Amino acid sequence: QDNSRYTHFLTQHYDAKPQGRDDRYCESIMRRRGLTSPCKDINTFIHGNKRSIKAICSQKNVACKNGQTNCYISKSSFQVTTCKLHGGSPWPPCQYRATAGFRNVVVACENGLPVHLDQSIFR
């Protein structure tokens, strides 16, 4: 009955309607979601309907970058925003450079729910 993994996924990779998609947006959402202590080197947010993200789990199964076999790639593209830390210091303030895009996403699923985003793809 524990769904903290799915909720942890949303908390770290989901933002239905971003208020922007620039550096200002990244520096704001990163702090709001708790990814600023220490500064997370890179993180990607997915925008759109939450039901569309869950639907990826019932699509084409593919191998994860780490070796695991429970990854799935989206059929269609999603609007995403990737925030890459500027410099290298893990100590805040954390400055971010944003890159917005429209592409397919690969997520690891568990019992039909996305639990991890295969980040390696947005580096």
Swiss-Prot record:
Changing D118 to N/H/S/A: Strongly increased ribonuclease activity. This is Angiogenin. The gene is ANG. Its EC number is 3.1.27.-. Changing K54E: In ALS9; decreased interaction with the ribosome and ability to repress translation. The chain holds residues 25 to 145 of 147 of the full protein. Changing D22V: Found in a patient with Parkinson disease; uncertain significance. Secreted ribonuclease that can either promote or restrict cell proliferation of target cells, depending on the context. Endocytosed in target cells via its receptor PLXNB2 and translocates to the cytoplasm or nucleus. Under stress conditions, localizes to the cytoplasm and promotes the assembly of stress granules (SGs): specifically cleaves a subset of tRNAs within anticodon loops to produce tRNA-derived stress-induced fragments (tiRNAs), resulting in translation repression and inhibition of cell proliferation. tiRNas also prevent formation of apoptosome, thereby promoting cell survival. One of its GO terms (cellular component) is growth cone. Changing P114L: In ALS9; loss of angiogenic activity; reduced tRNA ribonucleolytic activity; unable to translocate to the nucleus. Changing H13A: Abolished ribonuclease activity. does not affect binding to PLXNB2 receptor.
